[PDB]
Amino acid sequence: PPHQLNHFSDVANKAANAAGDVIRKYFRKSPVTIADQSAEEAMVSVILDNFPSHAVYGEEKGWRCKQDSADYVWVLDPIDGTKSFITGKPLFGTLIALLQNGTPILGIIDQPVLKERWIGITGKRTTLNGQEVSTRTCADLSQAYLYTTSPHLFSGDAEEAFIRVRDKVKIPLYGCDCYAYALLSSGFVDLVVESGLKPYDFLALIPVIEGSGGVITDWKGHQLRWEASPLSIATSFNVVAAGDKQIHQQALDSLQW
């Protein structure tokens, strides 16, 4: 297992703290691009000051590393949910993931306006603001509360797949971004289904959801993996996350991907 997780947490939390400071000045005062750049720059200042050998892939400026390669890769998105940010809606989030040879070992979802921070760590239960959180059981897809960001954020076949699961759930809801994954981790949402998600908007979710007892994969039900390198391309993935493995299963059958 990894031995440096507490030290990784402290820098993780400082990165997140520094992103928050930038984000709160620009939220509700184009501010979004200044915010997104400054915030990313703030996080890499912290991460690279504490670990010079480490690499980062940020949503604004891609890969950045001194060395040829690194065993440790920081995948960042300061504002996951730019449309929410632009419209004054405080459900966007800063996402921080640390990858050890391509496996995520830490993830943060921070909401700096709501002052809510979910940390996921390998081999620990996921916490929200220092308190342990847990997904909830849910019998059947008909009992499930579902979130997706948008309906026409699906093209052609993805929209058919999505419709199939949509018709079976208790109620489909829209318009959290990453917050919906935070909510599911805390046991308030049963299922999140999305298409066209870039790595810096899902890698942080994995330890958060998994350490809460939930499951998150692609539409085929495979492990969400993205090996970040200097020669890495941020390509779209499809994501299904559930509080309950039975629900995940059942969702996978409706997706027919």
CATH number at residue 238: 3.40.190.80
Task: Provide the residue range defining the domain that includes 167.
Answer: 134-257
* Rg from Cα positions in the chain: 17
Cβ–Cβ < 8 Å for 32, 85: yes
CA distances 189 to 39, 133, 137, 144, 169, Å, are: 29, 13, 10, 8, 12
CA distances 147 to 3, 102, 150, 183, 210, Å, are: 36, 28, 9, 10, 18
Q: Kindly provide the resolution of this structure in angstroms, with one decimal.
A: 2.5
Same domain flag for 86 and 174: no
Cβ–Cβ < 8 Å for 90, 27: yes
Residues whose CB falls within 8 Å of the CB of residue 127, separated by 6 or more in sequence, listed in order: 118, 119, 133
For residue 123, what is the domain's CATH number?
A: 3.30.540.10
Instruction: Answer yes or no: is 71 a known binding residue.
Output: no
Q: What phi, psi does 96 have (nearest 5°)?
A: -130, 125
Cβ–Cβ < 8 Å for 44, 64: yes
Cβ–Cβ < 8 Å for 92, 178: yes
| Solved using | X-ray
Same domain flag for 206 and 80: no
Same domain flag for 23 and 145: no
Tell how strand 145-148 and strand 171-174 pair up: parallel
Q: Quote the number of domains for the chain.
A: 2
Residues whose CB falls within 8 Å of the CB of residue 72, separated by 6 or more in sequence, listed in order: 51, 53, 54, 55, 98, 99, 100
Instruction: Answer yes or no: is 80 a known binding residue.
Output: yes
Same domain flag for 223 and 141: yes
Centre a 10 Å sphere on the Cβ of residue 156 and count the other Cβ atoms it contains: 7
Same domain flag for 253 and 199: yes
Same domain flag for 148 and 28: no
Same domain flag for 224 and 181: yes
**Which H or E run contains 255?**
helix 245-255
Instruction: Answer yes or no: is 59 a known binding residue.
Output: yes
Centre a 10 Å sphere on the Cβ of residue 173 and count the other Cβ atoms it contains: 13
Same domain flag for 32 and 146: no
